[PDB]
Nucleic acid binder design. Structure first.
Ligand code: 88G
Ligand code: MG
Ligand code: ZN
Lengths: 620, 81, 224, 23, 687, 146, 224
DNA sequence: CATCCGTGAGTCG
């Protein structure tokens, strides 16, 4: 849903309202009905409420960098003149509320509303078509709110105590209902570790087996657990049927839970579950006690102690250049190294000095928002600033913002800061331009067939061999293998096939091949599969959004284009390198490659490098 | 197993997608049927031989789409590509 | 328009709907009506117990499957209505192979057990079990340390309250052109002792009495 | 005071004394 | 928009224009901060958009020399001894000398404290240098900055990124019904407002002989009189309210150069771009998530953030070929109810209140004698009503607009009012609106901490201090360490100290932290005004100390601690929030990004003459643009029918848009989209 | 030329990835591949043969092996071909639709050439259809679902 | 484990009076005082100015010759005017003063059943040749009601609708002394604080607060 | 492997 202003609605559904006005005889013809809508007679407000009944509208936010930049919503009338947006889809639109404006389009045709409610509804497109990662997930206050209650506090009140002496076991409740009555009286903390018997939550897979023998857990079957009351409230949301999770909800944790529900539980479940998470986060974000004081932002203890050490290490380098033993290009390149190392040590100084109580660190480490590089720039030091050329400046900004930068300090930081804002506006232009080039280049690429049939695919290096022993997961596993369908049966050492051909790789099916010991798989690719016009379905595989095999007719070219250009803003290689590739220019670095394999003959000269290669197989 | 679907989430799209080849196909599937229902109410005013009326009980002021989309969930319609 | 009262049902619990409230009165009525049902209703539960074959807590009772701990928890969940304020005492004895329940309990006069089919402990053969129960009357919830014969007396968490768990939400209803009016939805789960519909009528009568003190001064103006 | 020049309200200033010249 | 807006406008330094450079001709070197800008051009004040770098402001102390270069005042150092003699230096002149930073410690006579000091050297280079080589030193610490920039308290605590916005945004503030000076300032507020020339200053000394809401009369010593006429309820260039109110009562003794009456955004002759609100740094039930702002209904009920805006509407009566347009109260097929607010002429009456769709100036024009419809001829025979030859060409109230009609200006050719060739009567009707702060209205601090109003809770829903005082604004904690603009946090602390007052402990002497603190500040009243000059002012030491000197309320209880925090009670549940909340007073400006302006929608409207597509602009009642990037979004979705419908019957299908309208009001089905008239033009343009 | 068509396709895809990987962004190789695929769909003409293919012209592998399938069956010399790597700008320009290429870049150049080669446009593309107002031949536009 | 009917004491000061209520349920005093604070700040009935009219003045944005303030500032001063009316129906007050001198609220002529409580309130500094003839309408109501609602009714062009702040309540808070000593001596003592506008007494405010709430919680007792 | 001419260089308002 979305908050469509009353005034906004009446002008969008204007012919629709004049229709039902002359219907219920509020107006005698279509001409009068118009004069009623314009005069804003009180009747039309009751009529408009009926007109917008489950008639979806399109919310769009410029610049539209991917297809989730336009989404459909069930329109809700609301007093006031602003459009009300659901918190979760902010990640998609990249829309904050520092004054952003959105467009609203009213789909007229029966097919248009159909395409809206089905293809374009926000509750269906929870996942990122680029990566399959959840975009409509707890983002800021939400994660901080959830991360609060799922934290295990040691000496917190109401905590479980063993029996010893004359007093029995303290901290054992009969049901979640009891523990709730405890924190209300003021004995129990919702963040303190306790033991409770639970009746409406499936235990862990490892413990359901120990306590039931996998007899199939049932709503009513009791069991004991060692968690915090707040962790319990959390699992009531996932809800039943989902294995209890006894951890602290970092964002990456919550990212996994949703992604798991994406795979297994149906779409309408994930939409409903993710709504329960949002409300839950905000209520507890309120009572998280996350607040910024000048007190909470502290200067490191060894501030001047550490900086004096690198200032003495720098004066030594300065005097080593004064005698002319150091080149001018080497002096700066070393001075850069001195101060870079300096800023790291200031950071360490904070982390250990800063409690995990501290709301600035409580926000950072929770995956709620913010970098520690910000927290360091805030409390420790700004560090190195960037030259107009781009090279780092020999002189460092020693003051943090908390202390206040000197006059000369602020001037040079300002120089660097602005050049960033300028570049940021230049790369965004080079991002959209590249995006539009990709869009035209892959337009005639649609999923046209269900199967190309070619046994051709390409090798994917799933695992890396370990010298000590064992198997190590490849870093590229997610992006290179996870969503692919197989074009060759994957067999281990035995004659036993682990995964068939024509099978979508899933999370467990990788684990099967990872435990089997096989370290290379062949998979159907868009590169390989040869169809007349465009590509087939099978090779492309799992549409990153749907989580299922791509539908026949999907504009997977444009979708691919978007996926690459959308995050184009966030680069340093860099975006030029990205263009330099897709345009296939003769590279800057122009690193040479061997024309024929063989033995290497390094014969370096101080003036010039020369590389001779003796062909392994005869040859010149 | 889930919570009662409210408003435009109903019928649950998952059970709806079960009865069709893909997302896209369901759209034209539903829309063309809604185009029959609004036809039926307009033609019933002045002409016989209209497309079959709502196979299920129409809700008060229910949109033709919402009707079609419901009777798809009731399997009461036939599917041709 | 005067406000309505509604009810959607279940055997042990139910939801109540109050609408339409004057804008800002959803929450004004919210948290106060919950803290009443959970705290300001009197009932009967267990204050302390005594086990025969127990001189310390860590060792389980001779002949019983469950630990000392899990027995306490099953007992807290026992629903009892005492007729006299003063503390009574009920005994529960059983031996041999089988399962002990709440129907095995021997209750004093005017003292009733409301869930005689509640599992308590599984006794094996040559398994002896004698327990003395101490029933009091109170309100809400009372810790164990506040209830601490010293020949095996165990302090128990007292759940006097006949209301188990209550949640509430405050949506907005559209009265006239105004979309400001508050609609209060309330979830109430009660024990097997009293129906939720009755628990509200008692919780509500409780609060009517408080605000009487204020009203007594002048009964100036209001309109329904 | 800060700007004891025109006839303004007294706005007390944390400062090192700034007497070089008025804006 | 405000007096500051105007002031900064005049001091703009723009590279653009004839004899200058194009925006496309500018490389990345022109636009970044050059070292020679120091004390001459502001490195903070510059646009955010594509115009960044090319437009700046002149630094405060900088002046222009007859050859058109930028000079700046430097104090002269003879031999380690600071002289009060001042010489202006051009940029290259300064390169040949050696200049000391302003805040370098100086003897009571004038000598330096340390031999080696911080020194600015040619080519942006800095190095410590013995005091025997010091030629000049900076006049003021706040010398590199502009007038706008200099008004951001604790500037040295904010990142240039948000300090830049905070600068640009002050000129975006809107004049409120009445203005409050900020509890926390920098000293610039006074000089700005005066030199802005939108207040009223006294020429010569004297005594107020007569005071009115209309004018102020002054009795000079030499006997002569000067009467100053107040500008009352005037429309600005941007429709803000330039309203001047007299300060001085009758018979007051006033001296020359004193502000005798302040104007828009000005209190006692000081720049007042906003109000001092009660701030709470905390997340609150998600309504402040992603820089959204939550407000107390007090600010609506008490007209705290309420402003006045005036629109000027216009219409004329020309000579046509069918006659001449005449303005009259007699408009074709209109009830006497719709004309009930007009005079005999056909003009709205002053004092009347107008809604959109209503009539302001009744104008009719003779329509072309074309053969009326054979279906409309017959319809005029039945009812026997003869058609008039005059089509209604009235001036009606545009969509969104509404208010009271506060003035009518009329110009007649008849009354020898020299009009342009062809015009007879010309009317201008002025309508003002008293805009209360609503959902979506853009608020901002002086620290670039912008954001729109998310929710306005009832006054009782608001989190409140112990004594029952409900806060005014609830800012989100999350959007604070990210932006690096913690100067907003320092403003909050100093703000509360300025609200409650304070008193350092003088027993056992003056405390060591308050040893640098000027005597005047060791004691302060409730609601006392202060100054934290840029690259000077309060330090984090004094601030922490001052937080403990916080005087108790009327009930004799201190409300906030030495951390600056205070305990809050949830106005909804009643229970106390678990942890102490940072509370204080922050200065909030109302920006000119109000929903009443920004909101817009269109079913059918006017169309493009050539391309037959909808026009663009809220003023033209145009539609949105569904562009090339937005097409790809539909295409990726695979929503072909939506997409098609958008660029066909919803845009430039001549016959389709009309026939889709009929299908909707008839309750039938949406037809099949025809051919896009734009494409028909392409083929003819190619032809 | 050294490692052959298939190896250069996996080169780009990982060099591309390595740049996004650096900045924390994870795109699935899939999408990159769709783009890279379009870059290699044309080969260059070394020898004209019996074909009417001008030598030194970049022609579709589908067209090249179907015109060499028609001339192999006719009895004449097939054109000798070498694979060639295209940048996305050039490839987009070399599209079958003069409509799509005019609306892309260098409009005046697109027209002057297509008006000489008497190029006909069979309106079967996304860009082509959006312009004329036909349902795009994708999604709920293909005849299968339509 | 104790029972005692609650009390409602009082410690006074002229404008504001603290109310003490004890003994209450543990963890109840907080959500009980707030329920009163939300009732007071929003729904306590009173009276204020709705519209006015001034001689020779047609709208809000203009100046009266001889007066130091504009009409906006005059209306803005009139917001602070504290009024109590007994007439359920609208009534009309008057103000006429000329010549040099300052006009106050003491120069208002209140009809029968209407009393000003703050005559020292500055309104306008009428200079020489200054004349000010004003006409104020005062109605009864509760909470806050905007000006803009008056003009649509049918009001003639002369009248100038003004925003109404009926609530005669100023500032409300509370504190709670909860005895948490480990015993059956655990209770909560509630100290409510009410400050009024000298329009009605702090008690009378709390009295109307009780009359409202009692009528609300009474539906919680009616049977289905 | 480097010059000279012609064509690109974000969106809404
Ligand atoms: C080097 C430079 C490039 C662009 C803009 C300004 C500068 N230089 C500075 O900002 C100097 C101060 C200055 C200003 C004007 C002329 C000369 C010098 N500040 C510093 O070099 C500096 C470096 C680290 C900490 C503090 C100040
Ligand atoms: Mg934004
Ligand atoms: Zn294939």
């Amino acid at each position: 849903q979305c908050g469509l202003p009353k005034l906004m609605a009446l002008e969008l559904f204007k012919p629709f309202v004049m229709k039902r006005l002359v219907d219920l005889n509020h107006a005698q013809n279509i001409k009068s009905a118009k004069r009623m809508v314009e005069r804003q007679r009180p009747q039309v407000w009751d009529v408009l409420e009926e007109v917008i009944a489950e008639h979806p509208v399109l919310l769009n936010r410029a610049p539209t960098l991917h297809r989730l930049g336009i989404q459909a919503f069930e329109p809700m009338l609301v007093e006031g003149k602003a459009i009300q947006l659901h918190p979760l889809v902010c990640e998609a639109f990249n829309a904050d509320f520092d004054g952003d404006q959105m467009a609203v389009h009213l789909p007229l045709s029966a097919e248009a509303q159909a395409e809206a409610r089905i293809l374009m509804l926000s509750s269906n497109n929870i996942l990122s078509p680029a990566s399959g990662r959840p975009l409509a997930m707890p983002r800021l206050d939400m994660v901080t709110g959830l991360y609060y209650l799922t934290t295990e506090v040691p000496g917190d009140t109401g905590e479980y105590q063993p029996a010893s002496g004359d007093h029995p076991e303290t901290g054992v409740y009969s049901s979640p209902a009891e523990a709730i009555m405890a924190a209300d009286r003021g004995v129990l903390s919702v963040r303190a570790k306790i033991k409770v018997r639970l009746t409406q939550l499936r235990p862990p897979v490892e413990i359901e087996a120990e306590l039931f023998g996998h007899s199939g857990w049932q709503p009513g079957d009791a069991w004991m657990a060692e968690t915090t009351l707040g962790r319990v409230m959390f699992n009531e949301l996932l809800p039943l049927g989902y294995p209890f999770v006894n951890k602290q909800m970092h964002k990456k944790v919550q990212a996994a839970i949703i992604n798991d529900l994406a795979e297994r539980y149906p779409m309408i479940v994930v939409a409903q579950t993710v709504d329960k998470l949002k409300d839950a986060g905000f209520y507890w974000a309120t009572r998280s006690g996350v607040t910024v004081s000048m007190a909470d932002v502290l200067v490191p203890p060894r501030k001047k102690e550490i900086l004096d050490h690198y200032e003495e290490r720098a004066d030594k380098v300065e005097k080593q250049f004064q005698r002319g033993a150091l080149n001018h290009d080497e002096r700066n390149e070393a001075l850069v190294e001195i101060w870079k190392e300096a800023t790291d040590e200031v950071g360490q100084a904070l982390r250990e000095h800063y409690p995990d109580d501290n709301p600035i660190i409580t926000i950072v480490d929770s995956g709620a928002t913010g970098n520690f590089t910000q927290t360091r720039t805030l409390a420790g030091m700004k560090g190195l600033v960037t030259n107009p050329k781009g090279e780092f400046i020999p002189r460092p900004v020693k003051s943090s913002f908390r202390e206040g930068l000197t006059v000369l300090e602020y001037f040079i930081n300002t120089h660097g800061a602005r050049k960033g804002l300028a570049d940021t506006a230049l790369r965004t232009a080079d991002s959209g331009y590249l995006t539009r080039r990709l869009v035209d280049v892959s337009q005639d690429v649609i999923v046209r067939e269900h199967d190309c049939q070619t046994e051709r695919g390409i090798v994917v290096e799933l695992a890396e061999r370990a010298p000590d022993g064992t198997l190590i997961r490849d870093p590229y596993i997610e992006t290179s293998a996870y969503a692919r369908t197989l074009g060759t049966d994957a067999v281990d050492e035995a004659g036993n096939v682990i995964v068939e051909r024509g099978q979508d790789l899933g999370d467990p099916e990788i684990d099967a091949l990872l435990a089997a010991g096989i370290t290379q798989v062949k998979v159907r690719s868009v590169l390989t599969c040869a169809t007349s016009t465009g590509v087939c379905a099978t090779c492309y595989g799992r549409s990153m959004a749907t989580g299922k095999l791509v539908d026949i007719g999907e504009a997977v070219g444009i979708v691919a284009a978007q996926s690459i250009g959308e995050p184009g803003t966030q680069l340093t290689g860099g975006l030029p390198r990205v263009q330099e590739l897709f345009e296939a220019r003769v590279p800057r670095g122009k690193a040479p490659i061997a024309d024929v394999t063989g033995r290497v003959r390094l014969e370096d000269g101080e003036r010039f490098y020369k590389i001779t290669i003796v062909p392994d197989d005869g040859g010149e | 197993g889930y919570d009662t679907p409210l408003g435009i989430t109903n019928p649950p799209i998952d059970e709806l997608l079960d009865r069709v080849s893909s997302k896209y196909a369901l759209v034209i599937y539903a829309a063309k049927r809604a185009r029959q229902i609004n036809d039926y109410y307009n033609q019933l005013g002045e002409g016989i031989l209209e497309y079959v009326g709502p196979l299920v009980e129409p809700g008060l002021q229910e949109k033709p789409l919402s009707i079609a989309l419901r009777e798809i969930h009731a399997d009461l319609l036939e599917h041709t590509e | 328009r005067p406000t309505l009262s509604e009810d959607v049902l279940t055997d042990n619990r139910s939801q109540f709907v109050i609408e339409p409230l004057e804008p800002g009165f959803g929450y004004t009525l919210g948290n106060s009506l919950r803290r009443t049902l959970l705290s300001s209703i009197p009932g009967a539960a267990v204050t302390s117990i005594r086990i025969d074959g127990v001189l310390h807590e860590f060792t389980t009772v001779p002949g019983v499957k469950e630990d000392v701990t899990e027995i306490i928890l099953n007992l807290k969940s026992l629903v009892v209505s005492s007729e006299e304020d003063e503390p009574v005492t009920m005994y529960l004895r059983k031996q041999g192979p089988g399962e002990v329940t709440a129907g095995d309990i021997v209750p004093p006069a005017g003292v009733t057990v409301h869930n005689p089919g509640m599992h308590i402990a599984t006794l094996n053969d040559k398994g002896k079990l004698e327990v003395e129960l101490v029933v009091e009357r109170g309100r809400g919830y009372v810790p164990a340390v506040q209830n601490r014969a010293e020949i095996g007396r165990i302090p128990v968490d007292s759940i006097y309250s006949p209301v188990l768990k209550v949640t509430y939400k405050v949506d907005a209803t559209r009265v006239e052109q105004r979309t400001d009016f508050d609609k209060l939805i309330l979830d109430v789960e009660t024990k097997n002792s009293i129906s939720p519909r009755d628990a509200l009528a008692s919780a509500g009568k409780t609060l009517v009495e408080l605000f009487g003190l204020a009203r007594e001064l002048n009964v100036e103006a209001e309109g329904i | 005071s800060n700007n004891s020049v025109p006839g303004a309200p007294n706005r007390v200033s944390f400062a090192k004394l700034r007497e070089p010249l008025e804006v | 928009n405000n007096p500051l807006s105007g002031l900064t406008h005049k001091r703009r330094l723009s590279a653009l224009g004839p004899g200058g450079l194009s925006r496309e001709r500018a490389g990345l070197e022109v636009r970044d901060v050059h070292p020679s800008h120091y004390g001459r051009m502001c490195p903070i004040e510059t646009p955010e958009g594509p115009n960044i770098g090319l437009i700046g402001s002149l630094s405060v102390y900088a002046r222009v020399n007859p050859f058109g270069f930028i000079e700046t005042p430097y104090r002269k150092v003879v031999d380690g001894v600071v002289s009060d003699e001042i010489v202006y230096l051009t940029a290259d002149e300064e390169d040949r000398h050696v200049v000391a930073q302003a805040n370098s410690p100086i003897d009571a006579d004038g000598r330096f404290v340390e031999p080696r000091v911080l020194v600015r050297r040619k080519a942006g280079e800095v190095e410590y240098v013995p005091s025997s080589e010091v030629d000049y030193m900076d006049v003021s610490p706040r010398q590199m900055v502009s007038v706008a920039t200099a008004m951001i308290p604790f500037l040295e605590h904010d990142d240039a990124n948000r300090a830049l916005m905070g600068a640009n945004m002050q000129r975006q503030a809107v004049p409120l019904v009445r203005s409050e000076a900020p509890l926390v300032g920098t000293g610039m507020e006074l000089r700005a407002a005066i030199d802005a020339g939108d207040v009223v200053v006294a020429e010569e000394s004297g005594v107020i002989e007569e005071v009115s809401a209309d004018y102020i009369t002054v009795m000079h010593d030499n006997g002569t009189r000067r009467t100053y006429r107040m500008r009352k309820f005037a429309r600005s260039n941007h429709g803000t309210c330039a309203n001047q109110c007299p300060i001085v009562d009758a018979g007051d003794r006033v001296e020359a150069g004193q502000v005798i009456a302040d104007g828009p955004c000005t209190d006692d002759g000081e720049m007042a771009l906003g109000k001092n609100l009660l701030v709470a740094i905390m997340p609150w039930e998600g309504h402040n998530y992603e820089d959204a702002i939550i407000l107390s209904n007090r600010l609506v009920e008490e007209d705290v953030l309420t402003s006045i805006h005036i629109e000027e509407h216009e219409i004329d009566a020309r000579d046509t070929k069918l006659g001449a347009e005449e303005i009259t109260r007699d408009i074709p097929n209109i009830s006497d109810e719709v004309l009930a607010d007009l005079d005999e002429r056909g003009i709205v009456r002053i004092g009347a209140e107008v809604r959109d769709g209503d009539i302001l100036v009744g104008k009719v024009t003779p329509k072309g004698e074309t053969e009326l419809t054979p279906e409309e001829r017959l319809l005029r025979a039945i009812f026997g009503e003869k058609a008039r030859e005059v089509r209604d060409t009235s001036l009606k109230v545009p969509h969104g607009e509404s208010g009271k009609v506060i003035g009518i200006r009329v110009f007649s050719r008849e009354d020898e009012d020299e009009l342009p060739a062809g015009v007879n009567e010309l009317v201008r009707v002025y309508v003002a609106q008293k805009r209360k702060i609503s959902d979506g209205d853009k608020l901002a601090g002086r620290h670039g901490n912008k954001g729109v109003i998310g929710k306005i809770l009832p006054v009782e829903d608001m989190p409140f201090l112990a004594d029952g005082t409900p806060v005014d604004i609830i800012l989100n904690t999350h959007g604070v360490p990210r932006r690096m603009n913690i100067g907003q946090i320092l403003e909050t602390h100093l703000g509360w100290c300025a609200h409650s007052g304070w008193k350092v402990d003088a027993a056992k002497g003056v405390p060591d932290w308050a040893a640098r603190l000027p005597d005047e500040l060791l004691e302060a009243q409730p609601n006392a005004i202060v100054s934290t000059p840029v690259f000077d002012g309060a330090q984090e030491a004094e601030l922490q100390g001052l937080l403990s000197c916080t005087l108790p309320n009327r009930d004799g209880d201190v409300l906030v601690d030495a951390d600056g925090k205070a305990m809050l009670f949830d106005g909804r549940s009643g229970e106390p929030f678990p942890y102490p909340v940072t509370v204080g007073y922050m200065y909030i400006m109302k920006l000119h990004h109000l929903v009443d302006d920004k909101i817009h929608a269109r079913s059918t409207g006017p169309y493009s003459m050539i391309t037959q597509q909808p026009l663009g602009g809220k003023a033209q009642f145009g539609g949105q643009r569904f562009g090339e990037m937005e097409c790809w979004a539909m295409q990726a979705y695979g929503a072909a029918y939506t997409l098609q419908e958008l660029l066909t019957i919803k845009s430039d299908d001549t016959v389709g848009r009309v026939k889709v309208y009929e299908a909707i009001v008839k309750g039938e089905n949406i037809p099949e989209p025809g051919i896009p008239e734009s494409f028909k033009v392409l083929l003819k343009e190619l032809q | 030329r050294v490692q052959g068509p298939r190896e250069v396709q996996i080169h780009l895809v990982r060099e591309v990835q390595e740049v996004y990987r650096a900045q924390g962004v994870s795109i699935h190789d899939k999408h990159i591949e769709v783009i890279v695929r379009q870059m290699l769909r044309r080969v260059t003409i070394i020898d004209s043969g019996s074909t009417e293919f001008l030598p030194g012209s970049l022609i579709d592998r589908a067209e090249f092996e179907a015109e060499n399938r028609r001339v192999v069956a006719e009895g004449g010399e097939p054109a000798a071909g070498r694979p060639v790597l295209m940048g996305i700008t050039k490839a987009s320009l070399a599209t079958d639709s003069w409509l799509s290429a005019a609306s892309f870049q260098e409009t005046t150049r697109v027209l002057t050439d297509a008006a000489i080669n008497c190029r006909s446009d069979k309106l079967n593309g996304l860009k082509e259809n959006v312009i004329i107002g036909k349902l795009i031949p994708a999604g709920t536009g293909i005849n299968r679902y339509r």
